[PDB]
């Protein structure tokens, strides 16, 4: 999962975990929506 | 601000210290030629006291309030 | 200044609030004097209508209770 | 300008507000308008004789390739 | 005072024979173990000493104070004015006990208000709620004839019924809780002599110019 | 007073009311039993006795013989290795009571282990190490909001059914009290689940960077940075040669040595230096320029200068050389910065209350901020971020952020501010900006956005200027005309670098590595005149009192300047001596041990 | 003619060479004092220090006791 704050592809078990993994958190507010 | 009543001899001699104790804050004092007593002001306590001139035997003769209504 | 009998009767004003800040006063023969702590200085006066006010003298500190001595 | 001779007029003093066709020096004294960029030094610092060429001037005035108005 | 360098009694007891050494200073109470502590240690309830010699039975069984203080079960004495206040200033609330806080009187010249406060009889009608419970401003009393300002000394206040002393009037302060003793101070003219007139209006005395 | 005589207590400072009396006692002891005798006859209690306090104003108080003899406990009073024993209170107090820092060292300092729980305690928020029986009673009795974590009655309940996430303690009637492992926090909805911790986020974490991870963290230098421990902790020390301090005062401008401490002349004879900037190596000739300002004296124009600076050693070997770039019409040519990216110079003059821009050569001027500037002071500029600051410090004190072209223009800080003199920004954490104030004399910084306002230096004697660099923050306190120095989070304590002169009108660090030269210019040459940077892009303009070419927006109908060259510099090193022939360019006279043109071939 | 240019701070300049002062100027002074001996023209006179004064107008020996130099 690329976060576009940053540019980093953060594996994809990160997402929708309730922690906010990089900076602005699309992993949690962008994608569990 | 010493907190003490003195007196001395007009021709500046003899001077000693009467009072020096229990003395919060004294106003004003007037000495008494006759019966030979010292009457001062305390603000602190809100009392009239007297004495002796050589400073002994202190006694509070008047406190509280004056009138009958107590204004 | 104001004057009064000695049960609290029948009083008169020798200075009708012409006085800046009195703080000790003390009478002999015809004369008041008092000591006044705004100007500093020490005055006197007839004791019973304010006339011929003169200033004695005039110190850097405040005067505290002054008394004729006789 | 001292009037006084002890400058005590001088004194406490804020500069006043130029007036329509007065133009404010740096050190906020004001002249009049007509004596910007004219070659003189009216200010007494130049403040009034700068960015010349990036204003126009009064019609009756030829303006140099400077931008100084006479 | 007993057994220290100065002889206080005519008859000379103060200082016995069979007196311990004096290791303070003079004015100041001696532990029985050498410390110094000074007077107001006495039975305060607060240990002081190194012994607790200054808390001892025999010492504080009949300790008594002065006429402007008030002294609790626990045989330490504050203000008279520190009872019924909601605050703990002896140590076993004696001072702010509910059976005493009813039943106690002011000393003659202070009003009582429903809380067990004391208050200075000034305090009844002045706006301010020094009881806490309201109990010094009845509204409907204090707006009576019978509470106006005396005409010679005071000023009233325009929004409220406080009176203020006149000497308040535009000190730079706010007397009246309504700013009304600070309005037009422009108008009020100095003593011609006692008095120094500032950059804002105000009169101060003399004697305070330049005094730093 | 008389009183105070020969009465055991030294009441003289120099105890000479003591000193010299007769004997007290029908032995010749001056003092009772109960006290100390010091040898100048003065009376100290007992438990005084060598308790650090020079209590013997002779010194008999703390003699080691007797300080090693004192019955001693270890939280009021211990032994310090030179068998004399410390006041418990002076162990880490921040000095050597001592003479070893023994009474300083970290191993009887903090903790050995912090008192860690037991089966018999409960842990409550991270380690409120307090009996178990805490647990759930439905009382905060641990004082953290974190007694009760999870507690759901029900006495047929274990989380090991997996009902919490991890590290229960068993619940006595509930199941299940469950604690956030480290480094986690509970969730507000489903305190069950722990959520992970951003420790990048805390103030001065890291001297520069930070990677979040789960209940942990990491931090590294960036590039260009080496990793390096101190007796404190990180620093990531700059690689190439050590930063340079240039101190411009009115009448010339010093280089300065941060690791050899040694000063050097440069510019010399001037005369009213305000401001400088400079810009790192621009030819790759070895050569950075400095840029400076130069205020109206008397009835004269001031100027805004420029000359060359030799990056390596060099002094009284290479005359400098300086040239005026022509800018006319300047008076307080207060604020200056150079746009090392998108090659302009950005410049305030406190007269004319306005922001000028123009080229490295004085070409295209063109004013950018004209309206609700007071005093326009401390101007700096951020292409990697497309904003530019300046600081205003006349009636009503305001620090704004504008983009370089002259758009979205806002204030940041309008809050408690008092002459906000001097303005700088830290490039590796966010973006930050930090600021000097004159009234208040604090430090501040804020983030670029103008959130999160912290006071980083307090009591900062008036500071005049700043700069920021490998982790430090230098300052100028101008009545005192003193260098001074922190670490840039505000932590630890100051320290004097350096005093010059009442003089002193800026620090500037000198450091290739202060403005980052790997930053790539977006200007694409299609603008003619000035190319202005913004956010994510650039943006052509025209120089003042021109327009552009109606139906264009690249072309003004303006004319155009070349460009003016520079002069050629002494490029002469080590020593070798500049000079100038019927050609006038600059050779060198090198010194021995050195061949080449200038110097350069050892 | 201007010299050179240094911050506000100077407060004074001094020039340090040997011609500044005739070095070769002899001591009039003849071991007499017991303490200082000040110039006067064409000669010498002693002083005491501050404070005491001569025995018995001896006008060399002071009250005073000799105190040691310091190098
Ligand atoms: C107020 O001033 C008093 C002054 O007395 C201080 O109180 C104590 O003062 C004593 C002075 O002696 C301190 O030291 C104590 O000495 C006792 C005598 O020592 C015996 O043993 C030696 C052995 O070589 C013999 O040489 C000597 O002749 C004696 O026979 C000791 O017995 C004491 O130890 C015991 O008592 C103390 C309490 O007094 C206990 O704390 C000990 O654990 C032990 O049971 C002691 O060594 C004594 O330290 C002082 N008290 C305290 C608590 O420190 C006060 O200190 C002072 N005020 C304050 C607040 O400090
Ligand atoms: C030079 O001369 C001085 C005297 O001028 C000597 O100082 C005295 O020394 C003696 C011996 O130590 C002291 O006497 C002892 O004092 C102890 C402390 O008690 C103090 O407090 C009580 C109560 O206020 C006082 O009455 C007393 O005077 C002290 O101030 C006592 O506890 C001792 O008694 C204990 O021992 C006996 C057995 O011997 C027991 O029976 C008792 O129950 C008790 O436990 C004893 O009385 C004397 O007090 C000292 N005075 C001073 C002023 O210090 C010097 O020692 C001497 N020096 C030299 C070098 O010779
Ligand atoms: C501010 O102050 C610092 C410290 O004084 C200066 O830095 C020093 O500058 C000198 C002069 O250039 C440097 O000297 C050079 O050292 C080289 C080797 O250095 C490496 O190895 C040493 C081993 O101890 C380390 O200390 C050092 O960190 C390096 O790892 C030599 O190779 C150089 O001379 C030789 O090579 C040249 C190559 O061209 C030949 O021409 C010579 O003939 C010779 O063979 C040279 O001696 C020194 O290393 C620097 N030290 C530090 C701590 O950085 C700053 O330059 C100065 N800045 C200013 C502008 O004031
Ligand atoms: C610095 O001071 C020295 C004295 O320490 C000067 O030298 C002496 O100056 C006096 C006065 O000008 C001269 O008289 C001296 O010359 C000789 O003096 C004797 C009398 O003592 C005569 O009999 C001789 O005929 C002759 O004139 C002279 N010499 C000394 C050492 O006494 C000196 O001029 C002066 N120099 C400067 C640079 O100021
Ligand atoms: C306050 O000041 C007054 C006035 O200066 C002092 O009055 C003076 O008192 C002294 C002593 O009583 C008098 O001295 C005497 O004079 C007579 C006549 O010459 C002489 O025979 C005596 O031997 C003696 O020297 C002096 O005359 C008198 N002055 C006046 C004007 O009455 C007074 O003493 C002062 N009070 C204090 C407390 O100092
Ligand atoms: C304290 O001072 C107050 C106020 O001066 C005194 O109050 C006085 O009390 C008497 C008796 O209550 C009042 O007389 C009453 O007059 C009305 C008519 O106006 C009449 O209807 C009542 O029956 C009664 O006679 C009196 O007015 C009042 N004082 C004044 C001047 O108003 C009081 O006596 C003093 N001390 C005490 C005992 O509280
Ligand atoms: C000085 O400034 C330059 C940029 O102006 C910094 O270099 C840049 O470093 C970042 C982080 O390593 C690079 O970002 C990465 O880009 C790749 C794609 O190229 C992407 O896959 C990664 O996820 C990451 O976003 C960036 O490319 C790089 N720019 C260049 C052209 O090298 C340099 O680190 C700065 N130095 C300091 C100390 O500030
Ligand atoms: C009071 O002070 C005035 C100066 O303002 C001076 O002329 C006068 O003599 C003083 N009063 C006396 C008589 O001491
Ligand atoms: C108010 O003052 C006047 C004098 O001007 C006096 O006659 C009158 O009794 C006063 N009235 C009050 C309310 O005291
Ligand atoms: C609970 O925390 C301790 C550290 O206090 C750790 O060693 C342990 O592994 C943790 N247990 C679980 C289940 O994560
Ligand atoms: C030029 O400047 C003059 C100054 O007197 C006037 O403001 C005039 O109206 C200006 N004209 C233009 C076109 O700017
Ligand atoms: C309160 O007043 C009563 C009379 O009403 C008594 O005098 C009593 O002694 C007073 N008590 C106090 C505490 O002043
Ligand atoms: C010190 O004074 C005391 C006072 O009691 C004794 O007289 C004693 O003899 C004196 N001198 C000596 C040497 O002890
Ligand atoms: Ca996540
Ligand atoms: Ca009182
Ligand atoms: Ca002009
Ligand atoms: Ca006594
Ligand atoms: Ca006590
Ligand atoms: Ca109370
Ligand atoms: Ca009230
Ligand atoms: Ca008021
Ligand atoms: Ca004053
Ligand atoms: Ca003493
Ligand atoms: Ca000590
Ligand atoms: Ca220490
Ligand atoms: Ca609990
Ligand atoms: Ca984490």
């Avoid at chain 6, 010093?254 to 010399?268: H, P, V």
């Amino acid at each position: 999962f690329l976060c576009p704050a940053e540019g980093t592809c953060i594996p994809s078990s990160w997402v929708c975990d309730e922690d906010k993994d990089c900076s602005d958190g699309a992993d949690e507010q962008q994608n569990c929506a | 601000e010493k907190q003490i009543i003195e007196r001395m001899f007009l021709n500046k001699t003899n001077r000693e210290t009467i009072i020096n104790h229990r003395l919060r804050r004294a106003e004003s004092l007037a000495v008494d030629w006759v019966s030979r007593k010292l009457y001062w002001l305390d603000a602190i306590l809100d009392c009239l006291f007297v004495s002796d001139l050589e400073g002994r035997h202190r006694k509070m003769i008047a406190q509280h309030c004056v009138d009958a209504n107590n204004t | 200044i104001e004057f009064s009998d000695l049960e609290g009767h029948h009083r008169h004003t020798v200075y009708d609030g012409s006085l800046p800040h009195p703080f000790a006063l003390t009478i002999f023969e015809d004369t008041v004097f008092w000591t006044d702590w705004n100007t500093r200085t020490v005055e006197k006066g007839n004791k019973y209508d304010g006339s011929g006010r003169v200033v004695l003298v005039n110190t850097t500190h405040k005067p505290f209770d002054i008394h004729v001595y006789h | 300008t001292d009037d006084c001779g002890d400058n005590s007029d001088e004194e406490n003093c804020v500069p006043r507000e130029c007036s329509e066709s007065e133009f404010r020096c740096a050190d906020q004294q004001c002249i009049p308008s007509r004596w910007v960029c004219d070659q003189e030094n009216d200010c007494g610092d130049n403040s009034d004789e700068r960015d010349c060429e990036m204003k126009t001037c009064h019609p009756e005035h030829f303006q140099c390739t400077s931008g100084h108005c006479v | 005072w007993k057994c220290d360098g100065q002889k206080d009694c005519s008859d000379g007891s103060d200082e016995p024979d069979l007196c311990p050494h004096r290791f303070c200073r003079l004015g100041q109470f001696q532990c029985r173990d050498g410390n110094c502590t000074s007077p107001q240690a006495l039975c305060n309830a607060r240990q002081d000493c190194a012994d607790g010699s200054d808390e001892d039975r025999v010492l504080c069984e009949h300790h008594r104070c002065e006429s402007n203080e008030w002294q609790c079960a626990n045989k330490r004495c504050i203000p008279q004015s520190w009872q019924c206040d909601s605050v703990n200033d002896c140590l076993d609330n004696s001072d702010e006990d509910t059976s005493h806080c009813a039943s106690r009187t002011c000393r003659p010249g202070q009003f009582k208000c429903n809380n067990g406060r004391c208050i200075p009889q000034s305090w009844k009608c002045d706006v301010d709620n020094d009881c806490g419970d309201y109990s010094d401003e009845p509204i409907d009393e204090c707006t009576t004839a019978a509470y106006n300002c005396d005409n010679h000394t005071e000023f009233s206040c325009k929004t409220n019924y406080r009176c203020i002393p006149q000497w308040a009037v535009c000190n730079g302060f706010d007397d009246c809780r309504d700013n009304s003793d600070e309005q037009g101070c422009e108008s009020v003219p100095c003593h011609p002599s006692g008095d120094f007139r500032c950059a804002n209006h105000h009169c101060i005395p003399l004697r305070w110019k330049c005094d730093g | 007073p008389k009183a105070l005589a020969c009465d055991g207590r030294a009441d003289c400072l120099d105890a000479s009311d003591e000193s010299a009396c007769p004997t007290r006692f029908p032995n010749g002891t001056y003092c009772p039993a109960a006290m100390f005798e010091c040898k100048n006859h003065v009376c100290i209690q007992s438990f005084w006795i060598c308790d650090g306090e020079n209590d013997c104003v002779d010194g008999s108080d703390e003699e080691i013989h007797l300080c090693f003899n004192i019955p001693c406990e270890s939280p009021q009073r211990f032994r310090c290795d030179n068998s004399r024993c410390v006041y418990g209170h002076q162990l880490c107090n921040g000095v050597d009571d001592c003479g070893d820092g023994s009474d300083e060292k970290e191993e009887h300092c903090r903790k050995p282990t912090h008192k860690p729980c037991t089966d018999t305690e409960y842990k409550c928020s991270n380690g409120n190490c307090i009996s178990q029986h805490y647990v759930c009673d439905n009382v905060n009795d641990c004082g953290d909001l974190s007694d009760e974590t999870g507690c759901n009655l029900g006495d047929n309940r274990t989380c090991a059914e997996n009902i919490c996430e991890q590290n229960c303690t068993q619940l006595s009637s509930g199941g299940f009290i469950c604690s956030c492992r480290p480094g986690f926090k509970p969730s507000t909805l489903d305190k069950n689940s722990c959520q992970d911790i951003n420790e990048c986020e805390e103030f001065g974490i890291c001297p520069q960077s930070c990677r979040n991870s789960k209940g942990s963290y990491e931090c590294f230098c960036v590039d260009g940075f080496k990793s390096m421990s101190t007796h404190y902790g990180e620093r990531c020390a700059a690689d190439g040669s050590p930063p340079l301090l240039l101190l411009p005062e009115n009448v010339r401008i010093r280089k300065y040595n941060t690791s050899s401490e040694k000063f050097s002349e440069y510019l010399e004879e001037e005369e009213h230096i305000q401001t400088i900037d400079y810009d790192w190596d621009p030819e790759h000739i070895g050569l950075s320029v400095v840029y400076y300002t130069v205020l109206a004296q008397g009835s004269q124009f001031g100027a805004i200068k420029r000359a060359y600076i030799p990056n390596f050693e060099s002094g009284s070997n290479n005359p400098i050389r300086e040239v005026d770039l022509g800018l006319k019409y300047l008076m307080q040519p207060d604020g200056l910065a150079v746009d090392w990216v998108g090659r302009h110079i950005y410049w305030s003059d406190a007269k004319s209350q306005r922001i000028e821009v123009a080229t490295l050569d004085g070409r295209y001027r063109k004013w950018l901020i004209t309206t609700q500037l007071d005093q326009p002071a401390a101007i700096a500029v951020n292409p990697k971020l497309g904003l530019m600051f300046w600081t205003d410090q006349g009636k009503q004190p305001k620090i704004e952020s504008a983009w370089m072209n002259g758009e979205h223009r806002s204030v940041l800080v309008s809050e408690n501010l008092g002459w906000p003199n001097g303005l700088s920004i830290d490039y590796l954490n966010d973006d930050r900006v930090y600021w000097s104030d004159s009234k208040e004399d604090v430090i501040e910084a804020i983030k670029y956005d103008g959130t999160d306002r912290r006071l980083i230096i307090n009591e900062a004697m008036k500071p005049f200027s700043l700069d920021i660099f490998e982790d430090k923050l230098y300052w100028v306190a101008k009545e005192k005309g003193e260098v001074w120095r922190q670490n840039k989070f505000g932590k630890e304590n100051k320290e004097k670098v350096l005093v010059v002169n009442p003089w002193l009108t800026q620090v500037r660090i000198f450091h290739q590595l202060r403005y980052n030269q790997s930053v790539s210019n977006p200007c694409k040459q299609v603008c003619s005149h000035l190319c202005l940077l913004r956010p994510g892009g650039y943006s052509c303009a025209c120089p003042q009192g021109s327009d552009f070419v109606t139906g264009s927006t690249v072309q003004c109908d303006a004319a155009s300047e070349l460009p003016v060259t520079m002069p050629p510099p002494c490029r002469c090193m080590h020593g070798g001596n500049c000079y100038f022939d019927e050609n006038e360019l600059p050779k060198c006279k090198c010194s021995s041990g050195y061949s080449g043109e200038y110097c350069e071939v050892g």
